[PDB]
Design a protein around this motif. Structure first.
Motif, PDB file in Angstrom:
ATOM      1  N   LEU A   1       0.817  -1.208   0.000  1.00 59.25           N
ATOM      2  CA  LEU A   1       0.000   0.000   0.000  1.00 59.25           C
ATOM      3  C   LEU A   1       0.856   1.265   0.000  1.00 59.25           C
ATOM      4  CD1 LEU A   1      -2.682  -1.132   2.585  1.00 59.25           C
ATOM      5  CD2 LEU A   1      -2.933  -0.966   0.103  1.00 59.25           C
ATOM      6  N   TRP A   2       1.898   1.278   0.829  1.00 56.28           N
ATOM      7  CA  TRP A   2       2.716   2.476   1.039  1.00 56.28           C
ATOM      8  C   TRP A   2       3.344   3.010  -0.250  1.00 56.28           C
ATOM      9  CZ3 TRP A   2       3.336   4.836   5.835  1.00 56.28           C
ATOM     10  CH2 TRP A   2       4.246   5.904   5.871  1.00 56.28           C
ATOM     11  N   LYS A   3       3.871   2.100  -1.063  1.00 58.01           N
ATOM     12  CA  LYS A   3       4.579   2.469  -2.284  1.00 58.01           C
ATOM     13  C   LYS A   3       3.658   2.789  -3.463  1.00 58.01           C
ATOM     14  CE  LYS A   3       8.808   1.914  -0.655  1.00 58.01           C
ATOM     15  NZ  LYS A   3       9.664   0.899  -1.332  1.00 58.01           N
ATOM     16  N   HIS A   4       2.356   2.555  -3.303  1.00 65.93           N
ATOM     17  CA  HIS A   4       1.389   2.769  -4.384  1.00 65.93           C
ATOM     18  C   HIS A   4       1.332   4.238  -4.807  1.00 65.93           C
ATOM     19  CE1 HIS A   4      -2.433   2.793  -6.596  1.00 65.93           C
ATOM     20  NE2 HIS A   4      -2.289   1.485  -6.708  1.00 65.93           N
ATOM     21  N   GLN A   5       1.076   4.470  -6.094  1.00 68.09           N
ATOM     22  CA  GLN A   5       1.055   5.825  -6.661  1.00 68.09           C
ATOM     23  C   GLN A   5      -0.057   6.729  -6.113  1.00 68.09           C
ATOM     24  OE1 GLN A   5      -0.005   6.185 -10.874  1.00 68.09           O
ATOM     25  NE2 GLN A   5      -0.976   4.156 -10.821  1.00 68.09           N
ATOM     26  N   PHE A   6      -1.091   6.130  -5.522  1.00 66.26           N
ATOM     27  CA  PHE A   6      -2.183   6.882  -4.906  1.00 66.26           C
ATOM     28  C   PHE A   6      -2.039   6.985  -3.378  1.00 66.26           C
ATOM     29  CE2 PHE A   6      -5.341   5.289  -8.421  1.00 66.26           C
ATOM     30  CZ  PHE A   6      -4.759   6.142  -9.339  1.00 66.26           C
ATOM     31  N   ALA A   7      -0.944   6.470  -2.820  1.00 62.79           N
ATOM     32  CA  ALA A   7      -0.777   6.393  -1.365  1.00 62.79           C
ATOM     33  C   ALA A   7      -0.340   7.697  -0.685  1.00 62.79           C
ATOM     34  CB  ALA A   7       0.201   5.271  -1.006  1.00 62.79           C
ATOM     35  N   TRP A   8       0.252   8.634  -1.426  1.00 64.01           N
ATOM     36  CA  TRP A   8       0.893   9.795  -0.779  1.00 64.01           C
ATOM     37  C   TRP A   8       0.001  10.613   0.184  1.00 64.01           C
ATOM     38  CZ3 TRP A   8      -0.708  14.756  -1.591  1.00 64.01           C
ATOM     39  CH2 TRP A   8      -1.438  15.016  -2.761  1.00 64.01           C
ATOM     40  N   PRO A   9      -1.295  10.820  -0.143  1.00 60.04           N
ATOM     41  CA  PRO A   9      -2.131  11.556   0.818  1.00 60.04           C
ATOM     42  C   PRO A   9      -2.379  10.824   2.140  1.00 60.04           C
ATOM     43  CG  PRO A   9      -3.143  11.465  -1.371  1.00 60.04           C
ATOM     44  CD  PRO A   9      -2.083  10.420  -1.321  1.00 60.04           C
ATOM     45  N   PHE A  10      -2.150   9.509   2.155  1.00 60.08           N
ATOM     46  CA  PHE A  10      -2.470   8.644   3.285  1.00 60.08           C
ATOM     47  C   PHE A  10      -1.273   8.284   4.177  1.00 60.08           C
ATOM     48  CE2 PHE A  10      -5.487   7.965  -0.143  1.00 60.08           C
ATOM     49  CZ  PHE A  10      -6.706   8.046   0.506  1.00 60.08           C
TER      50      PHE A  10
END
Ligand SMILES: CCc1onc(C)c1-c1ccccc1
Ligand SMILES: CCc1onc(C)c1-c1ccccc1
Lengths: 115, 108
Positions: free
Chosen positions: B15-24
């Motif tokens: 999850l952490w490395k996912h391209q949509f993860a930064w806001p989370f």
């Protein structure tokens, strides 16, 4: 298929959630006409409910347990997206989903079909 | 535990490395985003940075407890934001991965 994980989802997860005192709004599809919600299907593009999931489990519709889990997830997520933060239905969904996750924590680790 | 190790090294890592993860990856900053009503609506803030730190510091007693924090993070996002906001789609995408990975966690 009939798998160990799908049996768990039927016999433990659905068993617990279906009979829950907060389950009744989720036992059938949201009826936008009955509830007077002309925007419901504009906002929620993939309706889902526990009646549909239960029927799917009974009819061996799912190939993998993850597919059933995604339907549960969609049902809850639809509720949170459509409704207001302070609506009671959100609290009811949260209560059911906590049980879902608690039970999912003890689901069989590997999926495999019964002969 | 075996399950907590799995949530940390398998589930959270993906999850952490996912391209949509930064806001989370850190708490919602209501000041930086200019959202005075965020903490009036969301009473239990949660994020993957907080969950990761809890995993690292042996805060959890059971896998279920950690899974509930993941769920709170996603639910907060759905409850606060407008249905058509991109952040909702980003949460949905990550949540799907979360459940996919959780399905293969050790049963105990
Ligand atoms: C729009 C209201 C609503 O949203 N999700 C559900 C479930 C319901 C619901 C509430 C009462 C009865 C049946 C469904
Ligand atoms: C209030 C908006 C919001 O709601 N949940 C998250 C995550 C965010 C978010 C969006 C952009 C950057 C950081 C967090």
């Amino acid at each position: 298929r009939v798998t160990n994980q799908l049996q768990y989802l039927h016999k433990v997860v659905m068993k617990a959630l279906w009979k829950h005192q907060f389950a009744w709004p989720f036992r059938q599809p949201v009826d936008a006409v009955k509830l007077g919600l002309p925007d419901y299907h504009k906002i929620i593009k993939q309706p889902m409910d526990m009646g549909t999931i239960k029927r799917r489990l009974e009819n061996n519709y799912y190939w993998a347990a993850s597919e059933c889990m995604q339907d549960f997830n969609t049902m809850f997520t639809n509720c949170y997206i459509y409704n207001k933060p302070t609506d009671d239905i959100v609290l009811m969904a949260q209560t059911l989903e906590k049980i879902f996750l608690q039970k999912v924590a003890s689901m069989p680790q590997e999926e495999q079909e019964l002969v």
